[PDB]
Amino acid sequence: NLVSWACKLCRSPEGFGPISFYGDFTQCFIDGVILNLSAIFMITFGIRDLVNLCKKKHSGIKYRRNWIIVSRMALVLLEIAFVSLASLNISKEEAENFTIVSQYASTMLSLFVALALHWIEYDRSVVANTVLLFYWLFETFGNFAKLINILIRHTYEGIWYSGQTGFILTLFQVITCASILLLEALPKKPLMPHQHIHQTLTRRKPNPYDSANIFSRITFSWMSGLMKTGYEKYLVEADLYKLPRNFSSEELSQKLEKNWENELKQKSNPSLSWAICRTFGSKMLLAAFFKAIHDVLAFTQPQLLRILIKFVTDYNSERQDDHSHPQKLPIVRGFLIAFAMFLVGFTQTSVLHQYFLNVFNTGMYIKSALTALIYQKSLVLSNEASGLSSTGDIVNLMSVDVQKLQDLTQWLNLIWSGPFQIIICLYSLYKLLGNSMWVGVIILVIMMPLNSFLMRIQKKLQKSQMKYKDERTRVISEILNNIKSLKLYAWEKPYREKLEEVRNNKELKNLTKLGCYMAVTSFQFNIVPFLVSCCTFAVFVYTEDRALTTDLVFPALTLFNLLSFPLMIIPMVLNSFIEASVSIGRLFTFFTNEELQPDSVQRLPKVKNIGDVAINIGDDATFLWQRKPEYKVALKNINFQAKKGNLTCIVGKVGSGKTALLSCMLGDLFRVKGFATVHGSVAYVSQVPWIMNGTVKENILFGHRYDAEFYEKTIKACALTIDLAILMDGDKTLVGEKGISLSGGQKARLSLARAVYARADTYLLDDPLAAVDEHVARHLIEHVLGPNGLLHTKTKVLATNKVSALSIADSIALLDNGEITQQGTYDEITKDADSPLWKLLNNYKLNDLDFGNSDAISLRRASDATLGSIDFGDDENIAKREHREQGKVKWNIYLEYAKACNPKSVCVFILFIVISMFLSVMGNVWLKHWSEVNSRYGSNPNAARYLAIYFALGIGSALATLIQTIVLWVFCTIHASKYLHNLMTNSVLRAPMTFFETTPIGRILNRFSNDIYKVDALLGRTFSQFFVNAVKVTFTITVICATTWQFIFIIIPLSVFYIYYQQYYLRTSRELRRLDSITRSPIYSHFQETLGGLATVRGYSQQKRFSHINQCRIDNNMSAFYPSINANRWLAYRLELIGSIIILGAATLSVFRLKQGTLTAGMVGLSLSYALQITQTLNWIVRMTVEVETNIVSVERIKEYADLKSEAPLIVEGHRPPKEWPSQGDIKFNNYSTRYRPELDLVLKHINIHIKPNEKVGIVGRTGAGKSSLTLALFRMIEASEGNIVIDNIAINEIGLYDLRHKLSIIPQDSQVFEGTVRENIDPINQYTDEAIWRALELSHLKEHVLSMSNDGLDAQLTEGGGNLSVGQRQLLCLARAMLVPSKILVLDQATAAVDVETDKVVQETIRTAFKDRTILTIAHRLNTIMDSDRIIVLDNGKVAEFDSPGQLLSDNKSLFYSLCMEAGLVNE
């Protein structure tokens, strides 16, 4: 019945059906659906906006009425005129059709609504309105479809289907609608001059996303200005924009806090997950809608491919039949199918990136909200509940688990969109191939567990690699820290060999195994998609009686990809869900954790009167440390009053209640009974000082206003004047994890100075004086604490056992057993000696997750994501910024890396990439030929032959891929890694000592561990994924151009645009990733800092300030992360647009070949099968260029360290001295003078001295006299500026450094021990016997201790830095090392040693017994040790002032040595 009503409405022969015989929409469908629904859309939503805009004030923003609005209104009036005039053109027969008249009427009404809406929108909107933009888009599209329809019917039937005047008016309506669309979208409104006078913007500019109309938001055009800016210069945090309106972490945290509190109150089973879903879940629903549309559009494409191959076949059949009534097929159908393919691609892109936009926004919301809520929770979290877990664990709760809940949102929609795509695909393939599809399904089902098994093995080998990398890093740190000892002892060779052993025979072995398993997975992912199709066709051809023709063949090839790649991602989704589940469990355990009692102590306004109670604990109060597992009473029946000005002291033993009575007044303790009141502001001084990372000045000010007068007075009172005079920048010196490490007393005085400067009304001093020196303690008691001091008007409570501090107290209470047993003034206790207080006092990395499934690029991306790996951060990227974006790529680095690899191996690897892709393409060409033969015969002749050849080509491609990956890993990457590490080691170990002094050890350890790992595990993979996809795109374009040579003229400008976008994305995304990485870290560091000082922050009540700082840092990280994400969308939209244009060009040129009569179905099948797959490869090439550009900086750094200028040669062939030398120990300096560095003055000046054989010499001088430089001059750690040295008649400048240093013994200034066995630390070369080592240990008095360490004896392990050995034991170990060396010369450095005397006398014993025959030079600091010597070198300002016997020197009263002994207090008379 009902359809007859539609057949009464429409009265045209083509009917109300959607697609006509010619392939375009019928005129009945255009009038009845497209233009009518567009008009109804306008009539509803435009009037909705017309209502919603007129409620807003007209003077919010003033725009001047220039040509823009006049043009819009005038052209809308013109459009109304044309619609009316065309409505007059309707003939008698045309008027019978309901659709035409209804369409014109509804369009007229919608045009009036749009005419009003333009005028209202111009004044009362800052962006071009979305309703108008979409309405004019649909109106242009509908009128253009009508114009195309009319042109087609005129061409094929010779009639203007609605009159010539109808045609020309439709043309003018197309033009006018397009012009109004562009005038709505592109122009930017002109502000009135009043607004610019009002403007005062000087901070970061507002975000352009808020000013972007819907076409700009879909295409992400708002990013282009930032991409251009970041391509012209290096980006800095001031160049970024503000966050959009709703991204502030305060607002999000408040929303989620409201929902979480409602969850806690409403339900007896609260859950954090449902609170998060209830808060932020709307955008995930919208994203789900978009993902569904994307899936449907993605599966539409093989249908269009099948229809176009069918059209080509039927067209060629009809033309051959004529060559050898129903309507002969029109060629317009092919062009319209091609344009349909283009439209499907474009819409798919535009929808997919709005899906990504929504999921990434939701992830950012979750991260900001949860980070803010964790921080806000930790401040109120009770002291003991905080004590339950380490600060590192809670910082990992913020750092890891919130990252996992962020990452979940990407994977979230795939739990339904996987099965959705799989069901659509299986239905489509069933409609194509029947029951043959099930073998293709079964192959993927079987291959999934094998793929998970391989992923398991790769996770195993990745963990093993991280273990071995940490081991090598430990060895490198050992070598670098003790580099001076290595150079002086000449031990660099055995330790280099040990390092090489560890590097080669464990790490590179594991890397070879990991490379082979990555080759196996590469072969798996290559062969399985082929096997699916091959076995499906095998089952089809042998069982179905249908001919395996082209339209069945190539759409099936397209569909098997869309089947495989969702199936092979679902396990990774489930894995992510499990990780997010445990993360939610940890977070929920943290948020439900117990908080402080909020009404423990009543804060009140301050007290003004002196002697009036400011702190009162009354009604016999009782306080608890804990309420779990039991009610542990801290303090029982306390009664305590403290009064303004009166210093009131708390006395007790350790754990007898000191900390509890102050933590009470902080409100940390839970209160059972009684009441407690604290008037006024509070200032807490912790028992263990807490220092913020920053300057001394900021540690003092602590958020208060800077007052120079009181600041200087405070520093004077707290006795910080001397220290802050000594410090590098004074009070601007950095302290904490960054900068200097202050002593305990210094930290205590800083905390006390902070408390003083705060000027709070009430002070709670938790024993600051313990760490302070007694005279400085007297200074403090006089200046700050005492009755005459600064705080004499403030209430002060001081828990301490110092009798001196207690003597000035105005009230004293002994607290023991958790009870105030006794309280009074000091006289009241002093009068009774037997009372208790009297006696007891006086007598006692990254993860760039951006995957969307149903592509092979996406299967690679997702499998890499689930393997995860690691890719560590950069450091001191700030220094190179001074160059400020010259932008030229250093291609010499690439060639030097290509030479690290064997270049012929690189050529072979590239060749096998080419051969793999060639065999794939030839397999598809053979499949085309086979399907054409099947089409000719109408059956499957000789199935075995064609199928065997296709199978052989597929396995050829698979084996070529396997050989490629095997060669890449085993031959190129590992060889380059070995060469680079060996080169860098041999360079660094031979560098002069000035390099190690200037360059921090942190940098060198970073180079050795992190950059070497990047060169090992990542760079080869990035190069592989670049080259494979580049060859794949080259061969795709080759195939398409082979089918239609005219395609060259399209791909040239498309490649120009491709290079343009790739350059912009490369530079800007590089810099935005840098900004994100640098801004991410301060959040967790700040959280660490806050967790170390919760009692202080709650003491000063700086909770709100610290929360604001954390929120600002979260927002400052999101401000850099947001463009970093949206740059990917900006790139990917344009590259998928380029792919869509490629599909359009290929299809249209194919249809143009069809017109000339030279086209078979197989050519279209092959060319469009290849064109459809290019979209994701095009962008994956660019993102691999970016990852290659990032990772090769490691090669640049390694080449930097390789190029260091070395020391003098270790062996000089023409000058090698004998084995006996130095046989007697004669030394001569002949006019020797030297400087530490070229940037410094001469340290030793014109030394000329002769040291006789076997004589014992002492060297003395004031600070800066250059004593230490002799230790470096003899061993040639510093070269000569003038003159030379001669040892046993051999000059020292001629000899090689190994021959020199190997035959001089030294007891160095800094005793250093290597992590290893005792025998290794005494004799790494294993040159000396165990008995000699035992005798050396015996004489150095270590033997018994070494035996007591373990049963291994000599082989007993020594930890890193000699942790299990005392400093004296280390010095005796160095003494043993010097003992075993048979050289006749000894240097005994003591320029800074002051540790112990008991080891000193043992050193003297070994000097006079073991070294009895050696020439001994003592670089002496302890002057008292010297007087046994023969001759003394008195250095003064670098020159040898005196060289004479101690007796002769002390004979002269005016001699410098006499003055030294006098000032030292050794020789007064």
Curated annotation (Swiss-Prot):
The catalytic activity, as recorded, is: Cd(2+)(in) + ATP + H2O = Cd(2+)(out) + ADP + phosphate + H(+); an S-substituted glutathione(in) + ATP + H2O = an S-substituted glutathione(out) + ADP + phosphate + H(+)
Indicate where this protein resides in the cell: Vacuole membrane
In terms of Pfam families, this protein maps to:
ABC_membrane (PF00664), ABC_tran (PF00005), TMD0_ABC (PF24357)
What's in the keyword line of the UniProt record? Answer: ATP-binding, Cadmium resistance, Membrane, Nucleotide-binding, Phosphoprotein, Repeat, Translocase, Transmembrane, Transmembrane helix, Transport, Vacuole
Please give the InterPro entries that the UniProt record associates with this protein: AAA+_ATPase (IPR003593), ABC1_TM_dom (IPR011527), ABC1_TM_sf (IPR036640), ABC_transporter-like_ATP-bd (IPR003439), ABC_transporter-like_CS (IPR017871), ABC_transporter_C-like (IPR050173), P-loop_NTPase (IPR027417), TMD0_ABC (IPR056227)
User: What is this entry's stated membrane topology?
Assistant: Multi-pass membrane protein
Membrane-spanning segments: 30-50, 71-91, 97-117, 128-148, 167-187, 276-296, 335-355, 412-432, 436-456, 520-540, 562-582, 899-919, 957-978, 1022-1042, 1044-1064, 1136-1156, 1161-1181
Q: Which EC numbers does the record give?
A: 7.2.2.2, 7.6.2.3
Q: What is this protein called?
A: Metal resistance protein YCF1
State the organism named in the record: Saccharomyces cerevisiae (strain ATCC 204508 / S288c)
Please name the gene that encodes this protein: YCF1
